[PDB]
């Protein structure tokens, strides 16, 4: 059921957990560094888990898709063909920015955090900088121990702060991925849909130095030896069985103002969806003619598809459940309840009004802000502006550099500059700049930026062509050139005649002003948001209702039971899909083209000792009433005894609006069955060595 429960709520959900079917004690689950919870790691726009004492890690194919794409080329396309390393020496690096974060300690810092903020008095921007100074000090102290990375989280609008300390594994290698016709069977047609038939899994291996300490890639590094790892279920999963997931959901917005929902539904999601689809069409068209563009833009293209389709789905679900009306009625109730309290209700009412004022400030420039950020997110202008900002920041002492630009951030910045080599073609990027240029010209005069209007010298197709012809002169298209600029000082950027760099230098004062506006807004949110959210919480608690914080990229536990759902009168989705379902969708063309070995094994009924007698086949995917979101991809699904029964990977179509307004009847996790993983590694794209390592072969 509903609830992305933080570890600290475990006492509160131990009753419900046992009634749903958990046979482990909740005390065993409370031990976040023990068995099995200590096996769960963050990637961390995704989740994964160890499944071997020798550092083997399972996650989704969608999670490893960036890694797989980084190691693919047009001639040797691992996305299309799959990858299997027969020995550990055959494993390829997953890229310099691949990470596995293993949890080491959580600490509550609420008191000190609120003290730091309170100290700044009545000034909004000082409030933001005080919290930033606190966070940088706290993290620096925490990361004094080598090999560890720390993160400060805010929960329930600034009512609670906790610091997480993680061992940071820096050398992650690709060990196995199925062919993309299994890992992403059905492609974007099946994305966000049930019935699903997708074997969304892949394996990494974590490596550290011989000293045991984390190290960046090196042929002298050796497999990390996790304290705990998961084991496959020995009992078959069936309908109604207990399941639970622990993972790292990114964000939900269930506590938003009705006005914030209204703007997201009316402007944000349709705007983004549209921009994403425009860019998708262009790049699709270009890739059809050029196999190098196709492989190089594959990961970008997966994200644009996923997010655009998710937004279309949310807009549809909002209409399905009248979300706009449910937010308006619920807020009326909260605001009435507060007014019924005179004195002690006044601060939440004041807070409400301020959040509305801030929403209105943000709206005034929303088109300029979005369009600018996306324009500057193309590969050459993104690189130039990042590199030039770094050069500015390096002039300050480290403690005073903007987060993202401190010494601790250097490894990631540099890694991103190299990774872009596999994700960049100038001919494609020029069409993306052209699209964003044409969108900037349609903005009204009051949403324009002087520095961009000047750099353009006009408002017509000829100015656009000139700007593109000039940017074509940049040398930032080669990796070695981006890395030169990574080390160069401010003056050097300000002297250069590279047109991408000249663009950076000219817009940067403006970027810096917008950031101050965001920081000032965020400073007032820091005062108003905790106060309004405490009042929501107190209202829902007085209503009986569930109280848990919105997702914030920290570790959460959700639980429930395998079950389908009823999309309409006269029908039901069943909880499992089966091998014969995969074959029934076969067309022989992308995205319904399974490997031939899969088609043969199914036709010959080779079930590999993994058949569930209750469904007459080997299960493929299943539905359950768990509460997951973006960031839970790859999370392990554990049964009544803490054994691995699948991996979380998607939501059904009707579920996606639950980010704003939760609908119990139509919100289900979609997961890939562990037996399907095993089946593929037996009969389809064989990996006898990993099965034995795990050890189910």
């Amino acid at each position: 059921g509903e609830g992305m429960w933080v570890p600290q709520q475990l006492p509160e959900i131990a009753g419900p957990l046992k009634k749903a079917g958990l046979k482990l004690s909740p005390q065993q689950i409370s031990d976040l560094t023990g068995d099995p919870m200590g096996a769960v790691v963050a990637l961390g726009g995704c989740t994964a888990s160890f499944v071997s004492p020798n550092g083997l890690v399972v996650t989704n194919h969608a999670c490893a898709y960036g890694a797989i794409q980084l190691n693919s080329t047009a001639e040797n396309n691992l996305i299309k063909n799959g990858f299997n390393a027969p020995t550990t020496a055959d494993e390829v690096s997953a890229g310099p920015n691949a990470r596995v974060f293993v949890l080491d300690e959580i600490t509550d810092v609420t008191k000190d955090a609120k003290a730091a903020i309170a100290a700044a008095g009545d000034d909004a921007l000082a409030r933001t900088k005080a919290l930033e100074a606190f966070e940088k000090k706290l993290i620096a102290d925490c990361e004094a121990e080598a090999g560890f990375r720390c993160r400060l989280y805010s929960f329930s609008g600034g009512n609670t702060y906790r610091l997480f300390k993680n061992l940071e594994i820096k050398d992650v290698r690709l060990a196995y991925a199925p062919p993309g016709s299994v890992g992403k069977f059905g492609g974007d047609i099946d994305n966000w849909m049930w019935p699903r038939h997708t074997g969304d899994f892949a394996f990494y291996r974590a490596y550290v130095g011989k000293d045991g300490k984390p190290a960046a890639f090196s042929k002298d590094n050796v497999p990390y030896q996790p304290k705990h790892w998961l084991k496959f279920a020995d009992q078959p999963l069936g309908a109604g069985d207990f399941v639970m997931v622990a993972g790292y959901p990114g964000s939900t917005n269930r506590y938003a103002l009705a006005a914030e929902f209204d703007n997201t539904a009316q402007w944000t999601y349709p705007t983004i969806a549209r921009h994403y689809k425009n860019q998708i069409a262009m790049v699709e068209a270009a890739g059809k003619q050029n196999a190098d563009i196709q492989v190089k833009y594959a990961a970008t293209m997966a994200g644009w598809n996923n997010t655009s389709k998710n937004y279309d789905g949310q807009l549809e679900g909002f209409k399905r459940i009248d979300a706009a009306g449910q937010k308006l009625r619920e807020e009326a109730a909260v605001l009435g309840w507060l007014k019924g309290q005179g004195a002690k209700g006044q601060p939440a009412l004041d807070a409400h009004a301020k959040l509305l004022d801030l929403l209105e400030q943000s709206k005034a420039t929303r088109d300029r802000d979005l369009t600018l950020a996306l324009f500057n997110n193309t590969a050459m202008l993104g690189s130039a502006t990042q590199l030039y900002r770094l050069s500015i920041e390096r002039e300050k002492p480290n403690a005073e550099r903007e987060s993202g630009y401190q010494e601790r951030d250097l490894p990631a910045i540099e890694g991103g500059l190299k990774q872009l080599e596999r994700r960049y073609v100038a001919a494609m990027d020029r069409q993306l700049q052209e699209y964003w240029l044409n969108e900037y010209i349609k903005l009204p005069a009051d949403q324009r930026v002087a520095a961009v209007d000047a750099w353009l010298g006009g408002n017509d197709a000829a100015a656009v062509k000139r700007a593109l012809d000039r940017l074509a002169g940049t040398k930032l298209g080669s990796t070695e050139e981006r890395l030169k600029w990574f080390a160069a000082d401010r003056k050097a950027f300000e002297a250069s005649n590279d047109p991408a760099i000249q663009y950076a230098v000219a817009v940067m004062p403006t970027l810096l002003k917008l950031e101050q506006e965001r920081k000032t807004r965020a400073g007032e949110n820091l005062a108003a948001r905790p106060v309004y959210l405490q009042a929501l919480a107190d209202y829902k608690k007085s209503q009986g209702e569930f109280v848990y914080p919105d997702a914030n990229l920290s570790l959460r536990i959700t639980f429930g039971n395998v079950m389908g759902y009823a999309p309409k009168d006269g029908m039901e989705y069943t909880p499992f899909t089966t091998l014969e379902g995969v074959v029934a969708k076969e067309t022989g063309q992308d995205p319904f083209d399974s490997p031939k070995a899969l088609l043969d094994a199914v036709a010959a009924k080779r079930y590999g000792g993994l058949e569930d007698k209750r469904i007459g086949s080997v299960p493929v995917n299943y539905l359950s009433d768990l509460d997951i979101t973006g960031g839970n991809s790859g999370s392990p699904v554990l049964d009544a005894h803490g054994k691995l029964v699948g991996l979380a990977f998607d939501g059904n179509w009707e579920s996606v609006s639950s980010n704003w307004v939760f609908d119990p009847k139509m919100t289900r996790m979609i997961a890939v069955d562990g037996r399907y993983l095993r089946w593929i590694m037996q009969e389809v794209y064989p990996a006898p060595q990993l099965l034995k390592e795990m050890n189910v072969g």
């Binding site: 726009g45 995704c46 989704n60 969608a62 999670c63 994305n191 969304d200 990114g250 994200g303 996923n306 997010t307 998710n310 997951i628 979101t629 973006g630 960031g631 839970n632 991809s633 979380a648 990977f649 998607d650 939501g651």
Partner: peptide
């Protein structure tokens, strides 16, 4: 798929 947006 539930990767980060």
């Amino acid at each position: 798929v539930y990767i980060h947006p």
